[model samples]
Target: GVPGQVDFYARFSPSPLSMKQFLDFGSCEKTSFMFLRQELPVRLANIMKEISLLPDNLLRTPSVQLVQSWYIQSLQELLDFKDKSAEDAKAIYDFTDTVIRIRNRHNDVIPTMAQGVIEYKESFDPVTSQNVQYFLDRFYMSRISIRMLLNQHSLLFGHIGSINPNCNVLEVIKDGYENARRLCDLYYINSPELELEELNAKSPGQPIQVVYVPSHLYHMVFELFKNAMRATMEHHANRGVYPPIQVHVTLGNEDLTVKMSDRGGGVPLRKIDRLFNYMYSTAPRPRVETSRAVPLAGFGYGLPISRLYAQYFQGDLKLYSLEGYGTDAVIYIKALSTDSIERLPVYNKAAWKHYNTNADDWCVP
Candidate 1:
């Protein structure tokens, strides 16, 4: 029944390619391979840590790594048919028998290992929550970046699929355009003569119309709008009063500009330059005994990251402040060049199908 197992036991020799040899070879190829070399050991340490944290003998567990290794090696050997590729029927039968024995031994310890992982997850919910929140913030920023890219150029969606299913490139651009329109509407609603001087100064020869591509102009404005909203919300929550948030978008000969002004007690003059520095926040507010609750603020990343994105598309961001009145953030985006417009994939398609032969052709009847 043993099938010649005892006859060869004394002469059996170990393979030269041990686990240590494979790990050493992997490490020599790259310093980053250290993580892979230590992965099993680290996992074992984590399992041990969980076991130690538990106050009951029920959590004390067998060697999880050892069982895992056996399971993996058995599966690998069963799949690895190096010598049995063209073997006779008898040899193939012998190999199958060896594989079944290895699998049976490896399968015995899986239940215990699974129970330990389940217990570890139950005990570490708090730690897991923190990790999840960290990743959630990163994912939020990534989604925002994708939306910004889509809004700036519609052809981008034709090449790269939409990251947001609820809002496509056209939808994002439309939302931004509507928001800009609302800003213009609100400014006129509040102060009807806000742009009266510029309108009056226009010359007929110059034909001074506010010329801008709404899709290209609206994202930076939206970013500033977002910051203003955050400032207002945070101020209200902490100090029980709403602060004024004003946004201004203007068209210049060479650039389309947006100015987002806020009345949330302007940032200090000395710290103005550092306002857009990545991971730099102003000094904490002095503690007070009054009813004004100061909320914890400043992840120190938002403004700097926003500024970087704005600059990527030939735009500029500037900050201005009057000590106690408010802060004004100005963003200037160079008007889309004729060359840039021609390079757009949407324009290319329209040109090829409708305007290739006639340069002055219009889709309108």
Candidate 2:
């Protein structure tokens, strides 16, 4: 089960004791609490509290064991939420207590992971570090998905926002593209201006939008745009102008695909595989303790994290590049049934049967 997807909402967004809360919903009946929601918060509260209290040594004399401990705590938490609920009328304090504790956990996890990357930037063994980082990358992105889901869950459990029960895939892409453009502007210092366009105006789907999580998809899309924009700027370093980045989004009954292409010169075959490896960065900059002030250092996290985000939601990310020319990234986010988490696909395998719900009712944190 994509319990990371499920628990994310509780940690980042609480789902339902009862399906009574909603906003921007086209319409859906208030059924009893979802089978997954039953007993989840109580267990999540207990273990998550245990997790929240552990002293995160992500950057303090941190060794492989310290990070492993972090991974174990997080994995335990996800597995607990992953256990399907057999059956919530959450008590008020039970509800409030869970909310406060989960919010507190958010602070440490992000920084710890960020600094962990910094700490391990120049590992004693690059090959081993890369392999370990890939493992770390996957778990970290899964956890990130859970965290972002919180925003969506808040709405489900009666918090308010401009939301829909089934979220629109394209709309979220467009919104994220806009945000990326704004961020791109800031990151490049407004010098490397580029355009981002949606080519799907030529062909829209029969059921145009996919039911998906806004934040998860947005995180993925934004990261792609950021990478493409940076590449476009880097490619035309001395040239007077640069080409625009193009995105074509296609939606289907079973899944959604987004292809983004950049005219920036692509990486050679030798380094292409390393693109997903942690600490495998290319650009140079003054290293700040916290952020990119974009290159390999800041980047070691972006693409790998994004690809893992896609996989968490039953989707995948693929990259194709021409050494002298450009690169293309293809992403797919599927629409699947709410079944036992593992009962569904991981990357390429199939499920008992596929399920489709309204894009409006497509749910998330």
Candidate 3:
């Protein structure tokens, strides 16, 4: 099960032009979006603290020692974000003046980080499995948190402009299912059929406003489908009597909802305490990884990591399974990103009761 993790993190890297573009945008640049200045630095600082984790004897490992010795370079790179000292800071007044490419920057670091994991495994064979698991889980939390914000850094930082998004839920479902299927092939699992539905299928004449980061949605749904399909395939074992994993999607007031149900008999509901653990997985341990193929799944990273993606955007992922039946997983997202135009009124409406027009005023007031 743990071996699957080796290949899972192995291939993560950033593209060339995109990586350059991300770093080219000086973080000191001002933005209409308030969070880039505040949250990004805080998140990065948390990452620095988490990544520096190690058992005292970790220093005994040569490669681990070497990586730690130089690890602060990455930390330093991020700390610069907190300073308002970039040459472009005062000069840039508009949000779009600098386009931040989070994908590339994030991709660039994955290899180095994954390399550290490799060194840790190679060097510390038996010394720190539980400790390694603890650090890895936190490491991935930081990693996914960074990735989520990077994917949305532009939207997160944009205050001068408004995004009129027409994101469709159905498209992401179809695309993500196909992607998950392709990966399921690696495990020789039958890609189960995904039945996606939009509950509010009919529309008024006006254009709908579903403000979301579509790529983020794809990542979450894809993981759900990947897990459901894997469980179903493994349980049925070519008996050819497997039930199709049904996915129901809908856009509702203030939220986007997705429910995936699979009929591969579920895991112990009580023991799911470790479901999110990075070391907790039910798939076969990865035994090999050649250039032609890298194994996926069986690493407990996917579910918890996916949940991070959900929460980063003010959303959530949850699961429930019956010992006799299958699993029901629901993903919910507050439809509007923090930067969206409609987010304000909707936010105030919910957060402040004073926004209620017909509220009974207190007589004393």
Candidate 4:
């Protein structure tokens, strides 16, 4: 039954709509709500299918199982709805309430998934590990799309609906840096100060604004800040005074970029590219505690998930490292809201073809 339902929902492609399009439409009209109603279920089903593609042993982990159930429940809630006319205002309100609840349930999902990956580490050979990681990358990206859809819908349609069309980029960066620094202080004695310098500005203190979701940008900046501060502190454990993490913000014609530079020794990966792989942490395995409080640099989810958020709106996150020296984390955001299209993951015929094909190219026969 579940397989049949998943296949049905996965058959359709999600709307490739941009943030500016949503703003231009200005709140949830009847057609927009209808579009969202259809879009969210498809996204939920697609991720559920992706979850099933994970290795069987890994899927059996408790946290992963919980995540799987959450999607299933959300999809069921959306799909079980009876038809309602646009005139039925209370029905629409109830539906939005349900959607909000679904979004809230997934708040700490990245760490939960990370915990599952850690629990089932033995099941992963190199190839399997990469395959699982590939699934996670797409899975989380899809989740972001779903949440954005749901949140935007409720914000634009609910009883007390409102959205900030002009989200200030600079202010969000400062707030994110401050919050991350405060959190870093909880785990480390020597928390690094942020040194922010705006490059390519016409004048000092000029506002670089975009018609976008500030929370999304805040999450990306905070993750990058945490990584930088934690790296600098740990790299110079013997010294009480660590170097200040430098952040250079560049406002370009097409994109807004933030470069976070840290003096902590760069990551020494067997292969540097593996840094983006899920569960690939250089730090020792952390004990996952019930409290929300977490160590500054473990869990291995900060960079990859942050990249997903950046890519969610046609932006990107990248890293540059110099072994024994330090690392530079670069974030790119589409300056124009219209250009900030939501990057959705599609499971189509091509995907099915790849899944069916043989993947033994590396084996020497």
Query: Candidate 4, which segments miss by more than 4 Å at Cα?
Result: 27-29, 122-124, 159-163, 200-205, 268-270, 282-294, 353-365
Q: Between 1 and 4, whose lDDT is larger?
A: 4
What TM-score would you give candidate 2 relative to the actual structure?
0.62
TM-score of 1: 0.34
TM-score against truth, every candidate: 0.34, 0.62, 0.63, 0.87
Using alpha carbons, what is the TM-score of model 4? 0.87
Q: How accurate is candidate 4 locally (lDDT)?
A: 0.77
lDDT-superior candidate, 1 or 3:
3
lDDT of 3 by residue, 1-365 (tens): 32232223222221111212232342233432344444443444443443444654443455444544343433344333444433464433332222253344456453354445554445544435565555555555556555544554554443111222556667778898888888876565446776665575335333334655566678788888888887787788768666787987766657777888999789897776566754344243345665443344553356776776676545778998997678998988765444122110011122122212224566654
| lDDT (Cα atoms) of all candidates against the true structure | 0.39, 0.52, 0.54, 0.77
Candidate 2 Cα errors over 4 Å, as ranges: 1-92, 122-127, 145-155, 158-166, 187-207, 281-300, 335-365
- lDDT at position 245, candidate 1: 57
Minimal lDDT window, size 10, model 1 = 339-348
Clashing pairs in 4: none
Q: Write the per-residue lDDT of candidate 1 for residues 82-167, one digit (tens) a residue.
A: 33434255445444354345535644342344344344334533333333223223322322332332222222211112221112
Q: Find the candidate with the highest TM-score and give its number.
A: 4
User: Which model is ahead, 1 or 2, in terms of lDDT?
Assistant: 2
**How does candidate 3 fare on TM-score?**
0.63
* lDDT tens digits by residue: candidate 2, 1-365: 43453344334322322111233332321232242233333233323322332223323436433544554444444344334332333333233334334545554664455555555553324433433453355446545544433433444443133233466666676786677777766666543343444433325534355444466678788888887777887778778487887777765556567898888899888788676765564223345686754441253366777787677545788888899899999997664423102111121111101111114577775
Per-candidate clashes come to 0, 18, 2, 0
